Design a protein around this ligand. Structure first.
Ligand code: SAM
Ligand code: SAM
Lengths: 219, 219
């Protein structure tokens, strides 16, 4: 509906200003032929406020892409803050590195290349925890496992965020055989049953297709 | 669309459970003949999570109605925490006191009958500040006035939340001669220009009418 899309343009004119480093991140995608599957500016700004609400010095991010979301969330850090973002795709990492450097965030942001399910143990072992805020936005089937690792890297009051868990409302189809819809359905049922967190899911609308974000805080 | 309604039901099945005190507070609408406003269960849960992120011990709320939103947020507080809510209409404020007494929140929540524009000063004057989280959901024309007062009642890192700042998308009508629309537009431009906060507006869909919720952290 034009109304969701028009209202999103209205919100970002007032409160979703994109500076050059962010415009560059978006354009890096077409240049490197990467998929246009980043958060929107308004989601970007939302992630920034939540980070500020956790008084974030330490942020964990699964799924860098060109580092659009990374720039928004790293800008909530104070001078001596740290964001560690995980990326399977070395092309994606290398582009995210240029985009982070163009933003003057080289000293605050570290990109680890490799599978999330291999890097997460290495973050436990090397005691890089606890994180103030953790953004999960990678492949969907192992969402339930990424969250277990998330908890293992949390402190009481850590905000965990998991994006695209509604999937245009396809999670209503018990009979859907898409790995992503089945990953989200497992994750949503797991959240619902999890006693280590209090949580909800936000329904989001705008220029980006009908989206669902999970928010969970660690007790 | 029915997709939103169904997805809201999915989410509240999993994460939006309402106990006696919340369904009683809903019903107390019909039994005192007040309007079917109040947040959804899912907005209730979202507001509860925001209060815990803010580590809330003292919460301020404008517009009590039947205390539905009050009970949700109240339940984020320690035993040693307080919530003041301001209600224009004496009927509403008396009903609220029942539904809140029923929830066992009698000694954690103070209701105050009056126009918000008069009490908000009394609270500055009584030194009831600062508040961890302020929830604004009263008349829409005075929203920018309520916000200025909220800044007075704040500390750095305070979450201010202003609900219904989109009005089903009528804020896109600069020719609107509706006071609530022109009130919400003025508030939205004011957030747009305010250097004392970082803010966004979330577009919200589900069982309640399409609305928007402003989120501002005080720097
Ligand atoms: C949704 S995009 C991330 C976009 C980013 N959050 C933003 O808004 O700018 C998904 C990313 O996850 C990465 N990815 C997919 N599977 C992964 C895995 N198993 N481990 C780590 N990264 C993975 C993809 O390579 C891609 O870069
Ligand atoms: C949207 S309802 C609040 C419901 C609340 N969000 C909940 O879920 O329980 C609006 C309330 O604001 C009250 N109100 C209107 N103008 C007011 C004013 N000037 N000062 C205080 N309360 C006011 C109305 O009487 C009504 O109870």
């Amino acid at each position: 509906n034009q109304i969701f899309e028009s209202v999103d343009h209205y919100i970002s004119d007032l409160l979703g200003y994109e500076d050059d480093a962010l415009l560059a991140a978006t354009n890096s995608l077409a240049e490197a032929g990467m998929p246009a599957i980043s958060v929107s500016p308004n989601q970007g700004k939302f992630l920034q406020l939540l980070a500020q609400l956790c008084q974030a010095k330490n942020i964990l991010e699964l799924g860098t892409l060109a580092g659009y979301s990374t720039i928004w969330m790293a800008r909530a850090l104070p001078k001596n803050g740290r964001l560690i973002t995980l990326e399977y795709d070395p092309k994606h990492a290398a582009v995210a590195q240029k985009n982070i450097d163009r933003a003057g965030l080289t000293s605050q942001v570290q990109i680890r290349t490799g599978k999330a399910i291999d890097i997460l143990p290495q973050l436990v072992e090397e005691g890089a925890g606890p994180f103030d805020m953790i953004f999960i936005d990678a492949d969907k089937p192992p969402y339930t496992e990424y969250f277990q690792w998330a908890l293992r890297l949390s402190r009481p009051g850590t905000l965990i965020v998991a994006d695209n868990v509604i999937r245009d409302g396809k999670v209503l189809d018990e009979n859907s055989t898409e790995p992503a819809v089945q990953g989200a359905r497992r994750f949503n049922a797991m959240l619902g049953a999890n006693t280590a967190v209090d949580a909800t899911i936000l329904q989001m609308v705008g220029v980006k297709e009908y989206d669902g974000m999970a928010l969970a805080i660690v007790k």
